[PDB]
């Protein structure tokens, strides 16, 4: 280090869609930009439209058609709405999109959430539990990333019913393809209604496939640069049990960085 140089510009203000639960978008209901109109989880439309596009301003506000994405209140349950930027309590318009896919209202410390599995459900601010239903991802293209996943001993994760273990990587097997969603879930391409889930929150907990309907914490996963598939809520990662693929088990375990904990997306 010495006469350090370049600082990244703060003039960047991208407008992108924000995908979340079950691949749905943050949507200004019916292009209703009247003060107090409700914001909902809607299908991400086939074309880029205004009520689905949000500008990530440098003042920490999230705008669509000028109006600001504003909470109602600062209590678990208060809905979020569209509102003129200068008329609402400043603090209700500030938002922070973290690296882990959490959109938080700093002031309330509450978090954007899609509490309803139904397309069209209203968004609310809830206590942060790192649930799949409080995971988002920015960018106009909200399409899942369908990829295979290899790990220990170069074996690939394979779906066998409602179970999952390591097996020979086979480009042909459709049971080895997974759709990595915007909400942070890992869904089986064979039935995208299934999500890799951890039975419990205890170390040793076996992870397998369960319905994504509830959007729990055990169904939201984060792919770290170190190679782990991390659980934000339980401070734990996926583990090929005892570095033994033969046990046909992938469990929940704290990160020790061993080879049975590193994974890779093969595109």
């Amino acid at each position: 280090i010495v006469e350090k140089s370049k600082i990244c510009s703060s003039r960047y203000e991208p407008t992108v869609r924000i995908g979340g639960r079950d691949g749905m978008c943050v949507d200004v209901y019916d292009n209703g930009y009247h003060n107090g109109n409700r914001i909902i989880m809607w299908k991400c439309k086939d074309r880029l439209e205004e009520n689905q596009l949000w500008t990530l301003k440098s003042d920490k506000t999230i705008r669509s058609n000028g109006k600001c994405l504003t909470t109602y209140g600062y209590a678990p349950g208060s809905y979020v709405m569209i509102y003129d930027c200068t008329s609402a309590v400043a603090e209700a318009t500030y938002w922070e999109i973290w690296d882990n896919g959490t959109i938080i209202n700093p002031k309330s410390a509450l978090v954007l959430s899609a509490e309803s599995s139904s397309m069209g459900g209203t968004l609310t601010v809830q206590t942060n539990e790192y649930l799949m239903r409080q995971g988002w991802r920015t960018g106009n293209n909200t399409s899942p990333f369908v990829t295979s996943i290899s790990g220990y001993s170069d074996l690939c994760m394979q779906a066998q019913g409602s179970n999952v273990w390591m097996a020979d990587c086979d480009s042909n097997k459709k049971e080895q393809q997974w759709a990595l969603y915007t909400d942070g879930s890992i869904r089986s391409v064979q039935n995208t209604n299934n999500c890799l889930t951890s039975k419990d929150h205890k170390q040793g907990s076996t992870i397998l496939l369960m319905g994504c309907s509830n959007g729990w914490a055990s169904q939201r996963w984060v792919f770290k640069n170190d190679g782990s598939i991390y659980s934000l809520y339980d401070d734990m990662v996926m583990d090929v049990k005892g570095s033994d693929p033969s046990l046909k088990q992938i469990i929940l375990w704290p990160y020790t960085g061993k080879p049975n904990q590193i994974w890779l997306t093969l595109f």
Partner: protein, 251 residues
């Protein structure tokens, strides 16, 4: 710090190759940004710490050394015996502390895929990689490889198995598997889109505003289909092991 980073084609294993790439990664990182390792800021170093060498042996006798610029992980010169050859666009200070006690020579093209590919009338997708193509590069170059077609062709191999492998976890996994299965491979569309978008990915990550790159990164999967990335929460981001320094995010 340490420059005798060595790998030997002899009795290698996926484990020995991975140990090579690990060491090579530990050498070039000069920080973390949004938790991902980034190469050193070019202003932070003096010419004398700007280059390192990777010794690639086929035997304790036959082998070459490659000059790498830690500022961007590029190969700028290669050495065989008391002869070093510097690429046409290696920095000016190259020959000053790269292969000092050697007759240094300039090559007439740079290590840019494009120029290298222009020379080796082949493309990356045509040139197979693996322990066998590495062993031949070491032999061609050592032997007094003089042909420009084939020098350019073996640099492509070297650059991908070494510099491109250090940057992405994906490319090293691949290189590691061709070794474990004694099977050569031609880089797929994902590998190439990764190699092509190194800078773009590095920038987006460092310039990102609210978990968002100011500009989208369009990659391709193996089936050769668009994987557009534009967020730190997108999972493809994790195949990045080393970024090119572009700017310090304001605090």
């Amino acid at each position: 710090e340490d420059r005798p980073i060595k790998f030997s084609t002899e009795g290698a294993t996926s484990q020995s190759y991975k140990q090579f790439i690990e060491a090579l990664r530990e050498r070039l990182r000069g920080g973390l940004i949004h938790d991902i390792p980034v190469l050193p800021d070019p202003t932070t170093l003096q010419e004398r710490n700007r280059y390192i060498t990777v010794e690639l042996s086929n035997s304790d006798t036959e082998s070459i050394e490659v000059g790498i610029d830690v500022t961007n992980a590029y190969v700028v010169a290669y050495r065989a015996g008391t002869q070093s050859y510097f690429l046409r666009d290696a920095p000016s200070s190259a020959s000053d502390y790269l292969f000092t006690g050697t007759d240094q020579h300039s090559l007439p093209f740079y290590g840019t895929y494009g120029d290298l590919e222009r020379w080796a009338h082949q493309s990356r997708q045509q040139i197979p990689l693996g322990l066998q193509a590495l062993t031949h590069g070491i032999s061609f170059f050592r032997s007094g490889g003089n042909d420009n077609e084939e020098k350019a062709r073996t640099l492509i191999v070297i650059i991908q198995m070494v510099a491109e492998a250090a940057r992405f976890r994906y490319i090293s996994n691949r290189v590691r598997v061709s070794i474990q299965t004694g099977t050569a491979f031609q880089p797929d569309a994902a590998m190439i889109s990764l190699e092509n978008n190194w800078d773009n990915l590095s920038r987006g990550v460092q310039e990102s505003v609210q978990d968002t790159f100011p500009n989208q990164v369009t990659l391709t999967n193996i089936r050769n289909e668009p994987v557009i990335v534009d967020s730190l929460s997108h999972p493809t981001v994790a195949v990045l092991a080393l970024m090119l320094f572009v700017c310090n995010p304001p605090n």
